[PDB]
Design a protein around this nucleic acid. Structure first.
Lengths: 53, 127, 71, 124, 114, 104, 98, 76
RNA sequence: AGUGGAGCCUGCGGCUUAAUUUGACUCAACACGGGAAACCUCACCCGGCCCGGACACGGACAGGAUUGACAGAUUGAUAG
């Protein structure tokens, strides 16, 4: 008999998480990433970003 | 445990509105009148669905005889600035561990309930 | 382990111990039903539904939290 | 059409209308149903405990398309309705009564829903 | 470009479809000896071409599995009907296909051999 | 009648972008359109700064990935239908080619 | 577990006639995709399927906080019998001859 | 154009396909079989063709079983 | 060119806290885990719903298992 299992979460770092896991502290939002900074390190090959210098 | 010329030797305006007139006022006026932090609480917070507690605030004030304070009105919220209809209630203010019951007076108008309830020590170190 | 635990008694559920659900019509020779503890008309209501005659609040159960007579 | 037996078609009508979810199984759904013309069949039992429960349904029956056939054994009718998944030792939902029900909306085709609907026009 | 996502965002968003597809078909098409995918942008057709060393499990029987292998890809990842047309790819060499080999060695190490 | 059609080319692979831009300029003159040429719009360097060390006790190791997209447009004073007809065919992979009715 | 074999059969049939079922997991979510139980957190879209899954009959694949029920040949035969439909329906897993 | 296969049943290739998938001539097809002595039923090989008069049969003669294998004529 | 000194910042030790969540300890813990967290989050504390016991088996059970709620008691929550 649920009434409350959620709260409006649009604000700050208490609102979102990673996309393959749940994580805070470095959720990069730029250009539609929605990844935490640590899981995406494993995933950087399929995208097209690269480090040559 | 009620309005002006009682629990107030600290007289005229707390922020720009006299508590003597304010207890004859409504708080829909007070958010308009010289209460910017309360205004951001009463216009943007805007009667923030604590109504069952707000009923209980007016229930326990009604259920207790008016020459005495209300029985118990506990809140979890501590972000509540005292309204002129609130004045008189013995409001249990929760600090995340404990409910702190505060009778709220003409002087305390404009102050949050987390300003009378504490979440923090007057820090000791063996001090 | 933060602070929250609880016991349970069907505090986790509800039973409302016996639930005296509709059995209630004054039955004459067959066939005619008579109104016992007030019949409620609504569109969410069906055509047999009754009220929690909880007097001064007469709560129709097929109504959600409403239609309560105060007489 | 067809020439099937009435009670074993009263079995499958209670089986199909259970599948139709709207076999008003028990008096609460029934008094909500049999006070409506959604009710198109009402197979009663004669072995209902406190057979004013029969009369309760009989008082509900005579309005909104009167339907009065009477079988025995609520537990058979409860099996005919379907709560018990018959072929076991026992069930999570094993054999208990559905004493009087209301078949809203026969809802299917031939003999098993057609014989008694012929018969409930032949009886009524 | 107006009014879509940015051209900066678009070439970001191109690999985002690539990563979630390859991770998922690592989880399921490893039974094919998962060498990878090949999503070919063709007109009116998303030519997905499944690189594998056992392409006898991509259709199932009579194209059975493709109509649920596409129905994962075509329905979840935004494709209309007739767009995701599945294609096999039985790669010619497999000993130059370490992805399928560390797959296949895992059929000898986790699968069981000394 | 002619219709000045922009052919915007966006890619991240330059020599893939160059081999398709060679196809568009020649094929517009192979079957006659305007031929105008590669108006080299500047590349966009998408640089993102990341942590190289997760659970980063030790040394602050910063890692930056860049991704370079490459824009150019080809405005063609040429009849509207057969601008997009000759160009947009026969190039499926690798390079986005955007023929454009605008700049009319 | 609530929500009976009317809302469960909305999830049961929708797996069967397609060949695939999709859903999402979050507590601040509420909705699942594909004609679902209509703004609910991760339950009966999944829990009717989880009931069927722990009996077999389906392969619930998973990737990126998202579930991929794979209609196996037993659930092709099961929900054939469960919906009392005639024993060949071609449940949109057989339609193309490749 | 080749029809790559993961198995290819008993009419495998190497003058088992010179009259079965098509009628028009081919260059050469590798199979892992030594297709004269064992008469072994095995498929891990391929099928190379010229694609002039070969496409009409094998896309209706895919998905099949001459023995107990499954011909995947996916053309590329 | 400074730091350390100064004020303050942040991180940490320590203490303190009901909680001051946790990772780390020369280089290779220490304005470090883009760690600018209000509550939300949150780990932590102090409290509450709810079950996510799905399924294999079995029992309650259509007379009501369960649901829903008036309104009251309750409570941070008239949150059946």
């Amino acid at each position: 008999q649920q009434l409350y299992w959620s709260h409006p979460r649009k604000f700050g770092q208490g609102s979102r998480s990673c996309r393959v896991c749940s994580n805070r502290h470095g959720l990069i939002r730029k250009y539609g990433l929605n990844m935490c900074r640590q899981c995406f390190r494993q995933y950087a090959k399929d995208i097209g970003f690269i480090k040559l210098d | 445990v009620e309005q002006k010329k009682k629990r107030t030797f600290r007289k005229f305006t707390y922020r720009g509105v006299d508590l003597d007139q304010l207890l004859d006022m409504s708080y829909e006026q007070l958010m308009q009148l010289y209460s910017a932090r309360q205004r951001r609480r009463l216009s943007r917070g805007l009667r923030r669905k604590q109504h069952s507690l707000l009923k209980r605030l007016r229930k326990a004030k009604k259920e207790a005889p008016p020459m005495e304070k209300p029985e118990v009105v506990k809140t979890h919220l501590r972000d509540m600035i005292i309204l002129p209809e609130m004045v008189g209630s013995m409001v249990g203010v929760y600090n995340g561990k404990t409910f702190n019951q505060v009778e709220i007076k003409p002087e305390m108008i404009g102050h949050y309930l987390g300003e009378f309830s504490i979440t923090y020590k007057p820090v000791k170190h063996g001090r | 382990k933060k602070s929250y635990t609880t016991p349970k008694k069907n505090k986790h559920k509800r039973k409302k111990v016996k639930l005296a659900v509709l059995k209630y019509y004054k039955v004459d020779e067959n066939g005619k039903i008579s109104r016992l503890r007030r019949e409620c008309p609504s569109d969410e209501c069906g055509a047999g539904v009754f009220m929690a005659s909880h007097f001064d609040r007469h709560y129709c159960g097929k109504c959600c939290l409403t239609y309560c007579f105060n007489k | 059409g067809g020439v099937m037996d009435v009670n074993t078609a009263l079995q499958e009508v209670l089986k199909t209308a259970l599948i139709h979810d709207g076999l008003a199984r028990g008096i609460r759904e029934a008094a909500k149903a049999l006070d409506k013309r959604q009710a198109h069949l009402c197979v009663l039992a004669s072995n209902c405990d406190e057979p004013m429960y029969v009369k309760l349904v009989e008082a509900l029956c005579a309005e909104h398309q009167i339907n009065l056939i009477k079988v025995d054994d609520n537990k058979k009718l409860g099996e005919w309705v379907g709560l018990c998944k018959i072929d076991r030792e026992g069930k999570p939902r094993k054999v208990v009564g559905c004493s009087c029900v209301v078949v809203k909306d026969y809802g299917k085709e031939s003999q098993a829903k057609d014989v008694i609907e012929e018969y409930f026009k032949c009886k009524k | 470009m107006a009014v879509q996502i940015s051209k900066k965002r678009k070439f970001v968003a191109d690999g985002i479809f690539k990563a979630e597809l390859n991770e998922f078909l690592t989880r399921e098409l490893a039974e094919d000896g998962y060498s990878g995918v090949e999503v070919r942008v063709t007109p009116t057709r998303t030519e997905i071409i499944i690189l594998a060393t056992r392409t006898q499990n991509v259709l199932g029987e009579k194209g059975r599995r493709i109509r649920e292998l596409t129905a994962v890809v075509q329905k979840r990842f935004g494709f209309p009907e007739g767009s995701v047309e599945l294609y096999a790819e039985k790669v010619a060499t497999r000993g130059l296909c370490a992805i399928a080999q560390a797959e296949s060695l895992r059929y000898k190490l986790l699968g069981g051999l000394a | 009648a002619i219709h000045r059609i922009r052919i915007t080319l966006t890619s991240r692979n330059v020599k893939s972008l160059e081999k398709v831009c060679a196809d568009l300029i020649r094929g517009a003159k192979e079957k006659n359109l305007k031929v105008k040429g590669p108006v080299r719009m500047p590349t966009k360097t998408l640089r993102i700064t990341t942590r190289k060390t997760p659970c980063g006790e030790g040394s602050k190791t910063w890692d930056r990935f860049q991704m370079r997209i490459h824009k150019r447009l080809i405005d063609l004073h040429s009849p509207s239908e057969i601008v997009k007809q000759i160009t947009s065919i026969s190039i499926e992979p690798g390079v986005e080619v955007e023929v454009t009715i605008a700049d009319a | 577990m609530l929500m009976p074999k009317k809302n469960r059969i909305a999830i049961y049939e929708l797996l069967f006639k397609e060949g695939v079922m999709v859903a999402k997991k979050d507590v601040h979510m509420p909705k699942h995709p594909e004609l679902a139980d209509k703004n609910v957190p991760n339950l009966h879209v999944m829990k009717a399927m989880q009931s069927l899954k722990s009996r077999g009959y389906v392969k619930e694949q998973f990737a990126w906080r998202h579930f991929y029920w794979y209609l196996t040949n037993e659930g092709i035969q099961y929900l054939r019998d469960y919906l009392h439909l005639p024993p060949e329906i071609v449940p949109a897993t057989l339609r193309r001859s490749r | 154009y080749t029809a790559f296969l993961g198995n290819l049943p008993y009419d495998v290739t190497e003058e088992s396909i010179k009259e079965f998938f098509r009628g028009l001539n081919i260059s050469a097809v590798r199979l892992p079989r030594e297709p004269s002595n064992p008469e072994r039923l095995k498929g891990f090989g391929y099928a190379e063709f010229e694609d002039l008069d070969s496409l009409l049969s094998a896309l209706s003669l895919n998905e099949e079983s001459l023995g107990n294998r499954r011909i995947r004529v996916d053309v590329a």
